[PDB]
Design a protein around this ligand. Structure first.
Ligand SMILES: C[C@@H](Oc1cc(-c2cnn(C3CCNCC3)c2)cnc1N)c1c(Cl)ccc(F)c1Cl
Length: 292
């Protein structure tokens, strides 16, 4: 079985915690590979590998398990273990009842009925949570390559929610796809032009995630296609502030999108700037838009 290296240690599939299949019960689908709520009782999310998939898909599936299993940080989803000795293969993950961040933002947008569903501080806390996860990845020399709202999860819907990075499929592929599937709208110029990835790649992507968060779940670069975005960004074009976005928050975005990677902040600096935003009453007392 293939090996994987993280921090100072090397690992293989034999190192994955095998959970006996008989101890695992599926409860319900969680919007689908497919994903289920399961019990081991320990409440888990079950990621399945379709049996009709290929040997390569098999290897990618296991590699993702290895990757997540080796992280240890509060803002990265935990891997409970795996069930690889029976078909279909399972990966067992921390159950994140709040679901993915993009869906959460879109479904929890403040309304005339629920105008106080979300406030600016909630959004800043989500941003801080994911930045803390990104800082951990940066300091351990791991490049995610696809930081985006769709790949972040929430522990729960309500106020105590914690956001975590949940999906590592892109980093898995590169570790061992088509052009139209590349997340170009989250990528800096040196990434989509030269295939160069560094931690400053993730900084750029985080800026786009910030826009996703403060837009309350809009697709980046409204009305633009991938190729149009490629030309737009290469020429110096950047997104406008989301509706009602505080200047200090938009400033973090535009720093994340500096053309030269050396001019973009690392995640320690991003975290400091997010923290300052949470301290500023003029920022956190800003009302979010209410869609009618
Ligand atoms: C693989 C899958 O895992 C989970 C999905 C979910 C999930 C998705 N949707 N929901 C809904 C369940 C019903 N209540 C609203 C959320 C829960 C929770 N925890 C997980 N570990 C997943 C998905 Cl489906 C999407 C993005 C991710 F980053 C990840 Cl890691």
């Amino acid at each position: 079985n293939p090996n994987y290296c993280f921090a100072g240690k090397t690992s293989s599939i034999s190192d994955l915690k095998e959970v006996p299949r008989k101890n695992i019960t599926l409860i319900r689908g969680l919007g689908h590979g497919e994903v289920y709520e399961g019990q081991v009782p320990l409440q888990v999310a079950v990621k399945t590998l379709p049996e009709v998939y290929s040997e390569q898909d098999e290897l990618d599936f296991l590699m993702e398990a290895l990757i997540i299993s080796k992280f240890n940080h509060q803002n990265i989803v935990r891997c409970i273990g795996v069930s690889l000795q029976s078909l279909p293969r399972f990966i067992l993950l921390e159950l994140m009842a709040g679901g993915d961040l993009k869906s959460f933002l879109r479904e929890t947008r403040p309304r005339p009925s629920q105008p106080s569903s979300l406030a600016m501080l909630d959004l800043l806390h989500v941003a801080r949570d994911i930045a803390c996860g990104c800082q951990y990845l940066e300091e351990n020399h791991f490049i995610h390559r696809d930081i985006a709202a769709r790949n972040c999860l929430l522990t729960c819907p309500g106020p105590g929610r914690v956001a975590k990075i949940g999906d590592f499929g892109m980093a898995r592929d590169i570790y061992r796809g088509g052009c139209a599937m590349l997340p170009v709208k989250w990528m800096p110029p040196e990434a989509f032009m030269e295939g160069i990835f560094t931690s400053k790649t993730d900084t750029w992507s985080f800026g786009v995630l910030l826009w996703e968060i403060f837009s309350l779940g809009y697709m980046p670069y409204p009305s633009k296609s991938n190729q149009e975005v490629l030309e737009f960004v290469t020429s110096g074009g950047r997104m406008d502030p989301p509706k009602n976005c505080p200047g200090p928050v938009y400033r973090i975005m535009t720093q994340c999108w500096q053309h030269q990677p050396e001019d973009r902040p690392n995640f320690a600096i991003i975290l400091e700037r997010i923290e300052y935003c949470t301290q500023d009453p003029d920022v956190i007392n800003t009302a979010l838009p209410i869609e009618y």
